[PDB]
Design a binder for this molecule. Structure first.
Ligand SMILES: *[C@@H]1O[C@H](CO)[C@@H](O)[C@H](O)[C@H]1NC(C)=O
Ligand SMILES: *[C@@H]1O[C@H](CO)[C@@H](O)[C@H](O)[C@H]1NC(C)=O
Ligand SMILES: *[C@H]1O[C@H](CO)[C@@H](O)[C@H](O)[C@H]1NC(C)=O
Length: 261
């Protein structure tokens, strides 16, 4: 719907929380809740894309295309050598490739296609970034600002720098809007580059499950215990949604009626 823009060059903790609430406010389906939890809308909606513009300390920018139904990064842009440069993942083609390309790069302005030769799946990025897992790849507000300069406007960048760039951007924008916990981690360490602890990652790989448990779980009694992880790698066992509600920002779409309240 509307282009949300975050400035990682000149940002604070109270600039990130608004951008997140903006993200959350803009990504969420005005009519779909769950235990005081906004839930994302289903595939077919009025609007279907989010535009998030990131400003670098270097003042350069890099835009990002998010499906607002799920919040996966469909493609990112950057003005390079007097034209709109659109980057689309390789498993994205056809018409949704057009809607991604024609959105980031108006079909009336000079454009250059620079294909992403892989997908936006964590094991994938992890392997385009040289890691066996993303926790080896640091996060930070000034890590996203720096990453933006290495890329935006550059005629030549590597796949290593790119997927790592993609690891921190999909984690500091996409995962943090889905998770209050993740947004707090980045907010907690807003001055230091941090390795993401086990709960950041568990929650990442467990959104579909958590959103689903919270959905059909009356009175606050999830359907069956939920196995997660605390920050320290130990096992966490959720039973009631007001238990794992704090950490949740947005709920994935789950067809039907869940306790609105
Ligand atoms: C950052 O934004 C503040 C206001 O939020 C502004 O006063 C300041 O000049 C900006 N910093 C720059 C431009 O280096
Ligand atoms: C979800 O989709 C099915 C598909 O036919 C539809 O019939 C159903 O009413 C929707 N809601 C639920 C709770 O299944
Ligand atoms: C929305 O997409 C089209 C609308 O032209 C149609 O298939 C249907 O209304 C929706 N599609 C699905 C898969 O629900």
């Amino acid at each position: 719907i509307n282009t949300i823009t975050f400035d990682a060059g000149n940002a604070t903790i109270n600039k990130y929380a608004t951008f997140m609430e903006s993200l959350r406010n803009e990504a969420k389906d005005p009519s779909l809740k769950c235990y005081g939890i906004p839930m994302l809308p289903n595939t077919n909606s009025t609007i279907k894309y989010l535009l998030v513009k990131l400003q670098g300390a270097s003042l350069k920018t890099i835009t990002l295309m998010l499906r607002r139904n799920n919040l996966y990064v469909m493609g990112y842009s950057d003005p390079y050598d007097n034209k709109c440069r659109y980057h689309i993942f390789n498993d994205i083609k056809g018409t949704e490739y057009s809607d991604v390309e024609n959105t980031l790069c108006p079909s009336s302005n000079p454009r250059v296609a620079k294909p992403i030769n892989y997908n936006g799946l964590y094991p994938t990025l992890e392997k385009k970034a040289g890691v066996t897992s993303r926790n080896e790849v640091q996060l930070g507000i000034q890590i996203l600002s720096s990453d933006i300069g290495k890329i935006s406007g550059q005629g030549s960048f590597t796949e290593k720098i790119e997927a790592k760039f993609l690891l921190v951007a999909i984690q500091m924008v996409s995962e943090a809007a889905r998770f209050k916990y993740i947004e707090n981690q980045v907010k907690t360490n807003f001055n230091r580059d941090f390795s993401p602890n086990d709960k950041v990652l568990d929650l990442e790989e467990n959104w579909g499950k958590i959103s689903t448990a919270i959905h059909n779980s009356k009175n606050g009694a999830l359907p069956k215990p939920l196995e997660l992880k605390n920050a320290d790698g130990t096992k966490w066992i959720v039973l009631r949604v007001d238990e794992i509600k704090p950490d949740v920002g947005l709920l994935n779409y789950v067809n039907g009626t869940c306790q609105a309240t």
